[PDB]
Amino acid sequence: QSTLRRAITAAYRRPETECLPPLVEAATQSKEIRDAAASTARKLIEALRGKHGSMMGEQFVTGETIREALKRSKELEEKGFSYSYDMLGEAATTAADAERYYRDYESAIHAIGKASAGRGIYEGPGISIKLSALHPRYSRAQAARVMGELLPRVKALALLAKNYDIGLNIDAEEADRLELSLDLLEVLCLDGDLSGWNGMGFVVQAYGKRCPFVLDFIIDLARRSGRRIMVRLVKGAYWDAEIKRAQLDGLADFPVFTRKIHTDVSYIACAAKLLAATDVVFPQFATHNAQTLAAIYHMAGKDFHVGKYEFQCLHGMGEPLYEEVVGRGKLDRPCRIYAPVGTHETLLAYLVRRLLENGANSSFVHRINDPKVSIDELIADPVEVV
Amino acid sequence: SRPQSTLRRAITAAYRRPETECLPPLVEAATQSKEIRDAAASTARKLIEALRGKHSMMGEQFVTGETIREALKRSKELEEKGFSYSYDMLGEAATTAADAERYYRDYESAIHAIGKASAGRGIYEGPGISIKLSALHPRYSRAQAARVMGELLPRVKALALLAKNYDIGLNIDAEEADRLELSLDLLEVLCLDGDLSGWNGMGFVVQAYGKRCPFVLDFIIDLARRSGRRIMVRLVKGAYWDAEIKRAQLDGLADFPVFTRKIHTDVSYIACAAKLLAATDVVFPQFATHNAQTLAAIYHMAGKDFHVGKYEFQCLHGMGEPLYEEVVGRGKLDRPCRIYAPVGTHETLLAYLVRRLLENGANSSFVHRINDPKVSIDELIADPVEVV
Numbered sequence: 001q002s003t004l005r006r007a008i009t010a011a012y013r014r015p016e017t018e019c020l021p022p023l024v025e026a027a028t029q030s031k032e033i034r035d036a037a038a039s040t041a042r043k044l045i046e047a048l049r050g051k052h053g054s055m056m057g058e059q060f061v062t063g064e065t066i067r068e069a070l071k072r073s074k075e076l077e078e079k080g081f082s083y084s085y086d087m088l089g090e091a092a093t094t095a096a097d098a099e100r101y102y103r104d105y106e107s108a109i110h111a112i113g114k115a116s117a118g119r120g121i122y123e124g125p126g127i128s129i130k131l132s133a134l135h136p137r138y139s140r141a142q143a144a145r146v147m148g149e150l151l152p153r154v155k156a157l158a159l160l161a162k163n164y165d166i167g168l169n170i171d172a173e174e175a176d177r178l179e180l181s182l183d184l185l186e187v188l189c190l191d192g193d194l195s196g197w198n199g200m201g202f203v204v205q206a207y208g209k210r211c212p213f214v215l216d217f218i219i220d221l222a223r224r225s226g227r228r229i230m231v232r233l234v235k236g237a238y239w240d241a242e243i244k245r246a247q248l249d250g251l252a253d254f255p256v257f258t259r260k261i262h263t264d265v266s267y268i269a270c271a272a273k274l275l276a277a278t279d280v281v282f283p284q285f286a287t288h289n290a291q292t293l294a295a296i297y298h299m300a301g302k303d304f305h306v307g308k309y310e311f312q313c314l315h316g317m318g319e320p321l322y323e324e325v326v327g328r329g330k331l332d333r334p335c336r337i338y339a340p341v342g343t344h345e346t347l348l349a350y351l352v353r354r355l356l357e358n359g360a361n362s363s364f365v366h367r368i369n370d371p372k373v374s375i376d377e378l379i380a381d382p383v384e385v386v
Numbered sequence: 387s388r389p390q391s392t393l394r395r396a397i398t399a400a401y402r403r404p405e406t407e408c409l410p411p412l413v414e415a416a417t418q419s420k421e422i423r424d425a426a427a428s429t430a431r432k433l434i435e436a437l438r439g440k441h442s443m444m445g446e447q448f449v450t451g452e453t454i455r456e457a458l459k460r461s462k463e464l465e466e467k468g469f470s471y472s473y474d475m476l477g478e479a480a481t482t483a484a485d486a487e488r489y490y491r492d493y494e495s496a497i498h499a500i501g502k503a504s505a506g507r508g509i510y511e512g513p514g515i516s517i518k519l520s521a522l523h524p525r526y527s528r529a530q531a532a533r534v535m536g537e538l539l540p541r542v543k544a545l546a547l548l549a550k551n552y553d554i555g556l557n558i559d560a561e562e563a564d565r566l567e568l569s570l571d572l573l574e575v576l577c578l579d580g581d582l583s584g585w586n587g588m589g590f591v592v593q594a595y596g597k598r599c600p601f602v603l604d605f606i607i608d609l610a611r612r613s614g615r616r617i618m619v620r621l622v623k624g625a626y627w628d629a630e631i632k633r634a635q636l637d638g639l640a641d642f643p644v645f646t647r648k649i650h651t652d653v654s655y656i657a658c659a660a661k662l663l664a665a666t667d668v669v670f671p672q673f674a675t676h677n678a679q680t681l682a683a684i685y686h687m688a689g690k691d692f693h694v695g696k697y698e699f700q701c702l703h704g705m706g707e708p709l710y711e712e713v714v715g716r717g718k719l720d721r722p723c724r725i726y727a728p729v730g731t732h733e734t735l736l737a738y739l740v741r742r743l744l745e746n747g748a749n750s751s752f753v754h755r756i757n758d759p760k761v762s763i764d765e766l767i768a769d770p771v772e773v774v
């Protein structure tokens with residue numbers, strides 16, 4: 001327990017109207033930055049609108065096996081992309097399923113680590129894992145017991161990632177498991193067996209009210225532990241399910257925002273916090289929204305080196321945008337592709353979240369193709385609109 | 387004894403009966419002769435081979451129109467070929483009274499439009515409507531059945547009266563397993579309501595993935611006999627499987643209200659089809675499926691005697707037309723098919739579209755397996771009843 005942890009717990013269901021003022025202030029940019037970002041966003045969107053899958057989900061899977069996915073990665077790697085591979089799987093319901101997912105992650109780390117061949121955590125590939133894949137009652141058992149049995153499995157995977165010097169990211173799932181996953185991150189960052197490795201990564205969801213306070217805790221943890229934690233800032237993939245759970249629970253105040261523009265303001269405010277902490281954390285700005293991207297690109301300033309920060313996108317969604325970003329002819333910033341690996345069976349749940357993401361009228365990836373939506377609207381600054 | 391005590395006790399007893407105890411009577415009822423199985427395999431092979439010689443996640447292909455007027459206009463082409471329609475004004479799980487009132491008015495306006503378009507074609511040849519009870523009562527899943535019944539019954543009765551006045555079909559869609567009992571009690575009250583006399587358009591869905599399915603059918607067939615209504619019965623597998631599994635896990639159940647082996651649902655469907663085909667005097671069976679093997683099995687089970695009004699097939703808009711173009715029509719199988727036609731926009735599409743992705747994306751689904759290079763035609767035409 002700490003002042004930083006208390007701020008997280010107190011924010012869990014803080015009224016939405018009380019959450020917004022500090023985010024609005026932090027997301028407010030100078031006129032020079034706003035004008036530059038609007039110019040960059042317009043250029044990106046005009047390029048996107050010069051560009052343009054089925055329910056088999058083929059668009060979203062990088063390969064059936066890690067061997068297949070690694071072979072298919074060379075073309076984009078020399079263009080300036082990197083990869084984070086995800087062996088598909090989540091919400092294990094039996095011990096056998098959790099054991100199989102563990103074996104999949106373990107085998108992937110060996111293949112990815114060998115393929116990395118000493119490129120390190122920024123220039124080379126990494127892996128993403130879901131804690132719900134590794135424990136058979138992740139959401140239905142007591143958090144203390146879940147973390148206790150989960151810890152040795154995650155530590156063993158992190159030790160392999162350290163052996164090869166690759167990144168290992170913990171994906172963020174449902175809101176009620178944020179606290180458990182954060183306790184696990186803290187144990188790992190204080191574990192001397194992992195010293196000298198900066199590959200531990202952690203996702204924080206800007207649609208969540210606790211997001212800035214989680215970031216304060218992580219930034220402080222990185223600074224005191226000496227681990228340069230990789231922090232993937234996302235909006236969030238489970239919004240519809242969080243709303244349904246909160247409505248059923250009789251909750252007046254939800255753990256997530258209910259207006260999309262509030263999530264957008266939260267993201268920019270949290271990006272400002274991360275960009276002020278690049279000494280101690282490695283921010284990873286995961287977004288397909290060209291306005292969000294352009295804002296961060298200008299907020300980050302003129303100084304850049306590989307390892308300072310990166311962007312990220314999902315395989316099958318982000319390539320049109322990021323082909324306008326990576327490379328010396330564009331913005332010369334790197335992007336890491338989240339690359340699902342698996343069979344069609346393990347793909348299904350991930351596909352549902354992609355459908356909720358692509359099919360929502362509020363999503364950038366839907367609006368970019370909507371004839372009713374103007375470029376002027378797409379480049380709007382969320383602080384100015386809210 | 388309480389009215390229908392034996393039939394009602396059989397439904398309740400089946401609710402969470404162990405799967406292994408449910409299956410033996412279904413396997414026997416679903417067993418067909420070698421001669422019929424050979425003929426059905428030949429028909430299924432032809433249908434699948436056609437399904438490839440003649441021929442999106444965002445699901446524009448699943449919605450017939452944004453308004454009922456638009457949907458009705460777009461229906462003329464397939465009606466000309468011999469298809470019929472059941473229109474669904476998209477929307478469900480009303481969270482407020484205002485939402486439930488909005489959906490009620492959507493349905494009411496749709497019945498007037500569909501009824502005008504029907505122009506006296508009647509309940510079999512002409513279009514109908516499908517409704518979801520969760521759209522018409524706020525917190526349908528949460529409120530006690532006493533409060534839900536007392537407010538929902540007058541609304542559904544009013545819609546049924548409008549459908550009677552135009553002589554069109556009005557079908558109650560089946561939703562989550564925990565609302566089966568309420569919906570069935572509502573069906574009974576409507577079927578015994580003299581104000582609806584002379585109209586056979588009331589319809590009801592039964593889900594063959596549910597353990598209660600044959601016992602619900604027994605209750606419905608008996609209800610048809612005592613009410614004098616020829617109840618339209620849509621036999622489906624079911625659309626909420628993934629959600630039912632998750633809910634039963636969170637409910638702490640040792641035995642779930644749905645089957646967990648996919649071929650058990652197939653056996654259940656065929657057994658229930660045999661029961662319906664033996665009761666066509668008092669119910670109108672509507673076999674909703676996109677599975678060519680299921681379709682062929684029922685086509686042969688039904689035998690050589692057919693007339694429009696005996697039974698029909700059904701399919702979802704954007705899924706079933708390629709298969710049923712090999713079914714409807716004299717040179718094909720000469721059997722009718724009704725298309726379930728959603729009407730709405732992105733604001734009301736989400737829940738339905740999720741169920742379509744889970745249906746189309748699942749490795750166990752026929753519509754996925756037909757495009758799977760690892761699945762032989764032999765496997766697609768195999769009778770699942772012989773596996774068990």
Ligand SMILES: Cc1cc2nc3c(=O)[nH]c(=O)nc-3n(C[C@H](O)[C@H](O)[C@H](O)COP(=O)(O)OP(=O)(O)OC[C@H]3O[C@@H](n4cnc5c(N)ncnc54)[C@H](O)[C@@H]3O)c2cc1C
Nearest residue numbers: 171172234235236237258259260286287288289313363364
């Ligand atoms: C590489 C990568 C990794 C990711 N990892 C994770 C992860 O581990 N865990 C996770 O949960 N997400 C993760 N995400 C995010 C998620 O999968 C979506 O991709 C992301 O939220 C889309 O945001 P955007 O900026 O591209 O799009 P935008 O269109 O700008 O934003 C869409 C987002 O807004 C939010 N939203 C929509 N409607 C509302 C509303 N009414 N009220 C409040 N908020 C709303 C949702 O978060 C939605 O996804 C990841 C994304 C990427 C690109």
Ligand SMILES: Cc1cc2nc3c(=O)[nH]c(=O)nc-3n(C[C@H](O)[C@H](O)[C@H](O)COP(=O)(O)OP(=O)(O)OC[C@H]3O[C@@H](n4cnc5c(N)ncnc54)[C@H](O)[C@@H]3O)c2cc1C
Nearest residue numbers: 559560622623624625646647648651674675676677751752
């Ligand atoms: C016109 C029409 C109307 C419909 N109306 C309704 C309705 O009101 N309510 C409703 O719930 N459904 C309804 N359905 C059914 C549902 O929407 C699907 O279309 C249907 O279940 C798919 O069955 P199939 O025979 O086409 O395909 P198949 O591929 O043969 O069967 C797939 C089905 O098997 C079941 N299943 C999958 N995995 C398992 C498993 N592991 N264990 C047990 N069972 C499993 C599911 O029911 C799944 O949909 C309707 C379908 C049609 C065509």
Ligand SMILES: O=C(O)[C@@H]1CCCO1
Nearest residue numbers: 171172237338350353
């Ligand atoms: O699984 C999901 O949908 C998100 C995107 C990638 C990681 O977590």
Ligand SMILES: O=C(O)[C@@H]1CCCO1
Nearest residue numbers: 559560625726738741
């Ligand atoms: O809504 C659904 O998904 C099913 C199919 C049509 C009616 O009920």
